[PDB]
Amino acid sequence: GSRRYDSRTTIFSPEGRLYQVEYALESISHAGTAIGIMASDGIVLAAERKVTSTLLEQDTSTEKLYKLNDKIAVAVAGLTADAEILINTARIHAQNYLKTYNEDIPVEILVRRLSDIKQGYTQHGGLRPFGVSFIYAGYDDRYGYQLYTSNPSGNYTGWKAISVGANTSAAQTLLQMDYKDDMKVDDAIELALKTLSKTTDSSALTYDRLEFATIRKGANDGEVYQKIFKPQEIKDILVKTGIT
Amino acid sequence: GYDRHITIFSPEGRLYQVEYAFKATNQTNINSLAVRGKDCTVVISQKKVPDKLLDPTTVSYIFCISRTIGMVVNGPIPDARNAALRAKAEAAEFRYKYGYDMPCDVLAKRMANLSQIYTQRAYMRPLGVILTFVSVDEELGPSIYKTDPAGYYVGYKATATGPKQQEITTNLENHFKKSKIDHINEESWEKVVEFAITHMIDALGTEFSKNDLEVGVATKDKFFTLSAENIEERLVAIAEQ
Amino acid sequence: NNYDGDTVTFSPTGRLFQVEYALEAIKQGSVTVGLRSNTHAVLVALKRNADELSSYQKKIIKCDEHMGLSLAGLAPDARVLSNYLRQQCNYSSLVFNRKLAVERAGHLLCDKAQKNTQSYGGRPYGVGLLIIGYDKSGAHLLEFQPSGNVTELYGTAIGARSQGAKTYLERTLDTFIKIDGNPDELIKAGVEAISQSLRDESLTVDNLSIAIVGKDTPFTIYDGEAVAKYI
Amino acid sequence: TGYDLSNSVFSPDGRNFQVEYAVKAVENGTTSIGIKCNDGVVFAVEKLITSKLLVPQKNVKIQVVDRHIGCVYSGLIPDGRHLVNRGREEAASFKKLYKTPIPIPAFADRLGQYVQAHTLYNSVRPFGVSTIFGGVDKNGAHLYMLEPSGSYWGYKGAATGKGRQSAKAELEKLVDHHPEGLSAREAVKQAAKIIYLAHEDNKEKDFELEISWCSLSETNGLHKFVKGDLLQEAIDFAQKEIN
Amino acid sequence: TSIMAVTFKDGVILGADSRTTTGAYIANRVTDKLTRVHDKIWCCRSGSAADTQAIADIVQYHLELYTSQYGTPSTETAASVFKELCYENKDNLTAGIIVAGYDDKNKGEVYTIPLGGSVHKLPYAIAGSGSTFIYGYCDKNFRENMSKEETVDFIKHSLSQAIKWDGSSGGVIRMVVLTAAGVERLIFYPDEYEQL
Amino acid sequence: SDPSSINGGIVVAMTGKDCVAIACDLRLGSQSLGVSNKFEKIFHYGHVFLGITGLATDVTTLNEMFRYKTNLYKLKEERAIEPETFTQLVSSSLYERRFGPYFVGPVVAGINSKSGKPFIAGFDLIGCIDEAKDFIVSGTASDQLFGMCESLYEPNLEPEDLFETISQALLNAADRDALSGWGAVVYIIKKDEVVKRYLKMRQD
Amino acid sequence: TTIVGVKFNNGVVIAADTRSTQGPIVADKNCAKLHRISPKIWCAGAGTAADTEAVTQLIGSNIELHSLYTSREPRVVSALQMLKQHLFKYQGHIGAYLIVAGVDPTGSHLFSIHAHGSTDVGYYLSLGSGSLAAMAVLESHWKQDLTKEEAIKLASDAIQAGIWNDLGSGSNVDVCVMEIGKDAEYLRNYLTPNVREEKQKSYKFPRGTTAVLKESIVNICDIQEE
Amino acid sequence: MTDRYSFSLTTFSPSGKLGQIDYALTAVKQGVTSLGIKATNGVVIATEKKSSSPLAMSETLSKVSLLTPDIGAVYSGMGPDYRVLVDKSRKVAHTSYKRIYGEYPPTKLLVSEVAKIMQEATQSGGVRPFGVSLLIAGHDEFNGFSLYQVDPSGSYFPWKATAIGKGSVAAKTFLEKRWNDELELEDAIHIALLTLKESVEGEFNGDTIELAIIGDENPDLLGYTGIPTDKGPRFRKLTSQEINDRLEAL
Amino acid sequence: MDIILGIRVQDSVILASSKAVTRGISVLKDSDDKTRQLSPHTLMSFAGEAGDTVQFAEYIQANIQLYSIREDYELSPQAVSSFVRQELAKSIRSRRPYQVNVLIGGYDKKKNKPELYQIDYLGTKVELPYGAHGYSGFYTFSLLDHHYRPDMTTEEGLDLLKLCVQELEKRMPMDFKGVIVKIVDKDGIRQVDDF
């Protein structure tokens, strides 16, 4: 009947590799670059927009930096439509954990669940996996500042700075060169843009092609303040570092 | 290339399984006409019994979907029976949920959406029929809505379906540029049956016996088909003139 | 070929290869022969075994007190269709207090085989049955085919080199059907009938299996040392 | 092509190749006919005798539905016996819900929809039979023939199976000579004659005749098997025409 | 409620009250009880208004479907639909329905379905809470094959009594005449029958 | 048993001139025995205030219920939910469990940001909207507040006068009731800031 | 609670009182009972206050959808027939009693509908707790051929009689007139019968009457940079 | 039976493209041109009603639709695929956001729910992606006027003005020259007619052009006048007579 | 029913529960602990319906311990209370409820503060300086008001607790046969052997 049309996506190849996983990664190297630099007292998230025109509305726009709850944000690299389903079960799962324990969910648990959901899509069901990679940038009280990435495999690991999207080889080479561990949020701001000026496909880096975001311990009391920069604050930070 | 065996966008953007379905319809060499009167809608359809063994009356292509929406079908007759059984169920279901008689618009838009579902799922072939609903609506007066195996439907001042439709189409275009109205004017509905038959004789180039036509008239309050004597009466009145 | 993938496909001439292949499975099996008169019905069965140390496989299944069948071919499929007949023979005896007529049992198998080769993801059954039985209207002998067809016969064989015994029974048709009232002679006509199909493997007293049911005889099976009388 | 490998895939011609192969499975079967009498219907079937082992007149291939519809099919006997079995449930749930025996023009649609459903989906085979059914109800006699498309119509007379080219012509002689109406008693004689002539293609193996009829005047609207003196009187008329 | 239906020479006539009481207070004093469920197969409701209306909707839906597939329903049929819902759900729905109908073949016919769910063909029928008070009057005075002018007067007299003795009936009497000619509504105000 | 008088409590809310106030008592009983005096009935999401009286366990469930829905709301639309909308949300959530209700009687109070119009709303068990321009009351001594408030209230009070009224209203009704007392909390909501005052009242 | 509906030659007017109560306590002195299914089908509810508010919205949605899908003014008989089906599926636990009035192309209509599902057509219906006091007033002066003026005066009089003679009724009179081919006219607070006389002696306390223990400030904002 | 259509028809190809979705966008480039311009006090969206015959009446057919009382839509591509999406969207505004908040969704939230129907059409088993791109104009009180484009992959972006269809390349470059930020509603309409006159070869008059604005509020369609808390539709579709008037004033 | 007392001193929680178990007219067994250790710093005592107790204690103890293996991080005693409250609230709407009252005593090593929680069978959580359930809160709440101070040490609190039980011995009309006492504090969980 319909035996013929099956792609049989989920079987191994003779080498021991999952075909659909290897492709999804290649697809993800076409999406605009995203970079995370973790410092002692905060996290920077800078992502290079894709699609731009003098006729595109930019100020209200939001295509790569999404907020999950109070203290955790992500950056998307890949199919923005596919990701929008994985962002909605992340929020739901977060508040469901707040409903049952009365604590902000630990960063380790909210990562581990979105990787099980990715893994479970290559295990069975014959569906093509999501084409997404996340940079989970989050803060709990247990370990302080954390970074995580996941891949359409499911596998996830922690990083002090990492790149996904285009020129991850080129961007990862620069980042190893300049990273240091005494860094502060304002040095990391400077490094994240310095890496994006060199890897950019643009003839010149410009404020209207950036999505920028910090999570600082800074801000009143002990509480943590997440700040997705306005389009206008990015023009100021871009003259401050003197790239323009 | 499995795109000519199920409905997935071809490399070109087409849906080859749907473009094929249209050429499956035009094969019965039946030519259908539907024109509007002032207070009625006439539809005349060729009937062709091939062998003397088939009983003449059971062969038919006009169905009575409700009390005021008749539907003349063009295509292979099993798909028509399938499309007819399902349309009758909806005209009942409508009157049960909302308590008034399913207007024609609404029925044509329901079948359209039902057609679409079959070109979206990979496990049903589209229907191989063109459906032409005719009614005297309660609100909008005389109506015709012709629906396709893509899902497309649209209103009509008058329509023609079949292999030889090109002859009838261009004959209708000529008449409505002369008269400068959207509908055959003549007041009684017998004069509009006369008018329909005369444009069929011209288009196809051939005259009609009374066994070769099957006729359906929608006036407000009832839809009916005309018997072999009431057809004979029109035929003799056209030959007089 | 190309059309023998599934049973959903008619071939370009109309044949259903998956159903003609299932037929093959009965020509691999052992011969069994069935005949009947008006008073009694009889199955003579060649039991087959593997190597020496093997014991012979049972080819005769008791279905009820008045009905049983023998199988030829796939022994796992026979036990799935005889389980389904068992439930039917109870279902009749409890709800209508009525010994299930043989003519009906045949039409139930017919219907069950049809639904199983139309479904996508089924498989035709690969086994033949001779179903004998004695009801209100007398004795019957049915041949069941995996196609579905149930045919009522006076005698028949199925299996390997069946043709030898199928012929023998159409010459002797007038004589073994008139053997009424003597169960002993109807068994002897059937032992002869199975010796035409045998080429090698002379009968033994552990090789042969006989069932006989009739007007005055609940369904009984003779194995082992109980078939020393009929060789 | 490749438009034939699976069911309900259109070709460029519009043809549905799987259904066209199904018609070839009907043409392989044995011959059957139906005469629409003036007040009833007559059914006739050619049952090939394959062996002398077969018991005579116990493998009857005419099946009744409810208590006033005769069905007789050609092609693959299993496919049909499942179509009839299903027809019996549709008819018993009509008589349950409206408490009146199901009209014959209605019973025709319900069987068509069930066949037709097996050319929508691409995972169940089309049916490999053509059924000729009918009987008597409040309006009178109806005779229908059903193909593996789902296409059925009324017929003055119908025939399917291998010998159908012969029989369509012979049937036609009896409709031109009697516009008045071939009367019910006369049609049992004629049925046997037609089957005996259409049997000249299959004249290799002897056959057995079986007639049944549903008639308003004769059996009061029920369905019975013509038998005994009346079946024997017909068989004699048929042997007299071919010799 | 007090309803009756009476066959006669040319067809059938249905009669009904129009009072609908909830306790002692009269909620609505002009309630149509004679409802059309096809073009010549009418019915009369009595019992729990909520329950009969539900059964009449589903009958009017079944029969509109039945007409577009099988042709004209006989009156027998429409009766058996009513029956099938009353009897499957007899636990809750409390409905007593008279189905009167006219073909051209078999002229007038009356079926009554009491609370259990049991069709019964009768030459007249009565139901409702005020029926008890006219069982005697109806049985002496009925005659098969009355004149249309004579029947009307025989139903008008009966319900005149069924209103006078029962507190749960009253108001205008409606009558619906089912004949070959079609449907004709009649109405009789309380001054046309209380004076009598 | 009365599913509402197991725990008691009373909530009262008043408008003024460009400000609102919502206040309650802090007792939590299990019929005769008093258990705790720390139990608060008033919660805030964004700048909208919700008081909930009744069965104590459904106060805790229905507070963590509404914190869930509004957090999700605040992540999509990117602004705290307004009081006018939030009132439809309370109502729809309750009626969702029409059969076997939450035994509560929520009270909304806040100032709508766009317009500056102060806004209060009341509820009952199933969930109807009591709309008032005066004051909303709720709880087991809701009969006593209705009479109390109506005598005191004068339309348009300035924020520091409103604070006196809603005190006398709540203090008197608690000591005429056998399920309220043990302190009281009063919020004064203005657009810029919120000022919370704990009251010294009698411990009888 | 008192609700009347009076048909007249050119349209239909539906009037109510504004008093909503919860027990022997008057919860609200203005809460209108007139709801809006669709722009020319109005209805009003008696019985449980949460059933009539919720079940007009569950029919509001489905009737607005259906209105865009046909591209047509949504008939009254549509809402009447869809309400009936929802209330019968719960076997009359939902205690909702509505007067559904309105206009559409076919003409004016007016129905009542009881908890279980029984409906009534009428030329003038009343429903509610003081519905009996209203019913009397109608039976006295209603005639045919009422003009638009007389009917309003009639309807509002019936609601008045409910106010003076029933306890559950009170407060103000609301009206809504729907004519054929014009927009419905909602006359919110059409008649003030009784106003609250001014208090004999104003009551207003000095400041510092209340005794206080603490004061704190509650945070209602996103923390900011320092 | 055992229907085995669970495996999706879309699979990742060895080149890092999602095959079916690419093709979908070819068929969107064959659809008829449509464009939208966002101004200071409104949006306009317009298209050409392709009338296939003179017998056909494209009046009964619509390529612009009401989704809520304040959110319209227009489209490019497959007729059918459009009509069933407008019916899911009308439904899901009500079931999942209007009942349970009492308010019509804000424009940027509805688009999110519509972007979720596209996703499920390309993820789940046995379906093919939709053959359309929507432009969704709308107004809500906190973000003002907004215009959105939705793709058949699921992605949506907010545009200052934009075109999709056959002459999308020639239309987008003519909009960048004529667009600025000061545009009122009247001037943007006149820039919308000029841009459509390039891409339309045949008839160009009020009977064959469909044009609809999200603009100032209307209290004339309100329909139940006599209540200050309501404000009525912001969407108003310009009729045939109105459209010929802005061609005299061309 | 059966007595459970909880008093939170300056650096520990003390939980005291009765030995006796009364099935039938006999006192069947009178040494059986009525308390399950959840984790090395949280102790949960429980009392209520027959047999429901054991089932609702081992159930909770399984999820807390599946959570300590998963993260290698002992849940705070603040969390553990809201998880027991979540279950009890679900049970009241179910076909058959769980009538179990719990005192959760725990030493939070995060802030070096002990905490006591009371959840009753309806499902109401409240932080308390001392609590009880049943009829015990009727005899002791008036004695703890007079003597308890927040600065007491463990040695002092036990002398207050010896007095509370001596109040129950006079007025209670039921054997409970003295208590078992367990202390939760920063050093772990120990059992006071004496009365």
UniProtKB/Swiss-Prot annotation, chain C:
The modification Phosphoserine is found at residue 11. SMART domains: Proteasome_A_N. It comes from Saccharomyces cerevisiae (strain ATCC 204508 / S288c). Belongs to the peptidase T1A family. Present with 7210 molecules/cell in log phase SD medium. The keyword rRNA processing does not apply. The 26S proteasome consists of a 20S proteasome core and two 19S regulatory subunits. The 20S proteasome core is composed of 28 subunits that are arranged in four stacked rings, resulting in a barrel-shaped structure. The two end rings are each formed by seven alpha subunits, and the two central rings are each formed by seven beta subunits. The catalytic chamber with the active sites is on the inside of the barrel. It is found in: Cytoplasm; Nucleus. It comes from the Eukaryota. This is Proteasome subunit alpha type-6. One of its GO terms (biological process) is proteasome-mediated ubiquitin-dependent protein catabolic process. The proteasome degrades poly-ubiquitinated proteins in the cytoplasm and in the nucleus. It is essential for the regulated turnover of proteins and for the removal of misfolded proteins. The proteasome is a multicatalytic proteinase complex that is characterized by its ability to cleave peptides with Arg, Phe, Tyr, Leu, and Glu adjacent to the leaving group at neutral or slightly basic pH. It has an ATP-dependent proteolytic activity. Pfam families: Proteasome, Proteasome_A_N. There is a cross-link at residue 188 (Glycyl lysine isopeptide (Lys-Gly) (interchain with G-Cter in ubiquitin)). Coiled coil: none annotated. The lineage of its organism: Eukaryota, Fungi, Dikarya, Ascomycota, Saccharomycotina.
UniProtKB/Swiss-Prot annotation, chain D:
Keywords: Acetylation, Cytoplasm, Nucleus, Proteasome. It is found in: Cytoplasm; Nucleus. One of its GO terms (cellular component) is proteasome storage granule. The 26S proteasome consists of a 20S proteasome core and two 19S regulatory subunits. The 20S proteasome core is composed of 28 subunits that are arranged in four stacked rings, resulting in a barrel-shaped structure. The two end rings are each formed by seven alpha subunits, and the two central rings are each formed by seven beta subunits. The catalytic chamber with the active sites is on the inside of the barrel. Present with 12000 molecules/cell in log phase SD medium. The proteasome degrades poly-ubiquitinated proteins in the cytoplasm and in the nucleus. It is essential for the regulated turnover of proteins and for the removal of misfolded proteins. The proteasome is a multicatalytic proteinase complex that is characterized by its ability to cleave peptides with Arg, Phe, Tyr, Leu, and Glu adjacent to the leaving group at neutral or slightly basic pH. It has an ATP-dependent proteolytic activity. This is Probable proteasome subunit alpha type-7. It comes from Saccharomyces cerevisiae (strain ATCC 204508 / S288c).
Swiss-Prot record, chain E:
It is found in: Cytoplasm; Nucleus. It catalyses: Cleavage of peptide bonds with very broad specificity. Pfam families: Proteasome. Keywords: Acetylation, Cytoplasm, Hydrolase, Nucleus, Protease, Proteasome, Threonine protease, Zymogen. The active site is at residue 1. The 26S proteasome consists of a 20S proteasome core and two 19S regulatory subunits. The 20S proteasome core is composed of 28 subunits that are arranged in four stacked rings, resulting in a barrel-shaped structure. The two end rings are each formed by seven alpha subunits, and the two central rings are each formed by seven beta subunits. The catalytic chamber with the active sites is on the inside of the barrel. Belongs to the peptidase T1B family. The proteasome degrades poly-ubiquitinated proteins in the cytoplasm and in the nucleus. It is essential for the regulated turnover of proteins and for the removal of misfolded proteins. The proteasome is a multicatalytic proteinase complex that is characterized by its ability to cleave peptides with Arg, Phe, Tyr, Leu, and Glu adjacent to the leaving group at neutral or slightly basic pH. It has an ATP-dependent proteolytic activity. PRE3 and PRE4 are necessary for the peptidyl-glutamyl-peptide-hydrolyzing activity. This is Proteasome subunit beta type-1. It comes from Saccharomyces cerevisiae (strain ATCC 204508 / S288c) (Baker's yeast).
UniProtKB/Swiss-Prot annotation, chain I:
GO terms for biological process: proteasomal ubiquitin-independent protein catabolic process; proteasome-mediated ubiquitin-dependent protein catabolic process. Keywords: Acetylation, Cytoplasm, Nucleus, Phosphoprotein, Proteasome. Present with 21800 molecules/cell in log phase SD medium. The modification N-acetylmethionine is found at residue 1. Non-catalytic component of the proteasome which degrades poly-ubiquitinated proteins in the cytoplasm and in the nucleus. It is essential for the regulated turnover of proteins and for the removal of misfolded proteins. The proteasome is a multicatalytic proteinase complex that is characterized by its ability to cleave peptides with Arg, Phe, Tyr, Leu, and Glu adjacent to the leaving group at neutral or slightly basic pH. It has an ATP-dependent proteolytic activity. This subunit has a chymotrypsin-like activity. Pfam families: Proteasome (PF00227). It is found in: Cytoplasm; Nucleus. The lineage of its organism: Eukaryota, Fungi, Dikarya, Ascomycota, Saccharomycotina. Belongs to the peptidase T1B family. This is Proteasome subunit beta type-4. GO terms for cellular component: cytosol; endoplasmic reticulum membrane; nucleus; proteasome complex; proteasome core complex, beta-subunit complex. One of its GO terms (molecular function) is endopeptidase activator activity. The modification Phosphoserine is found at residue 76. It comes from the Eukaryota.
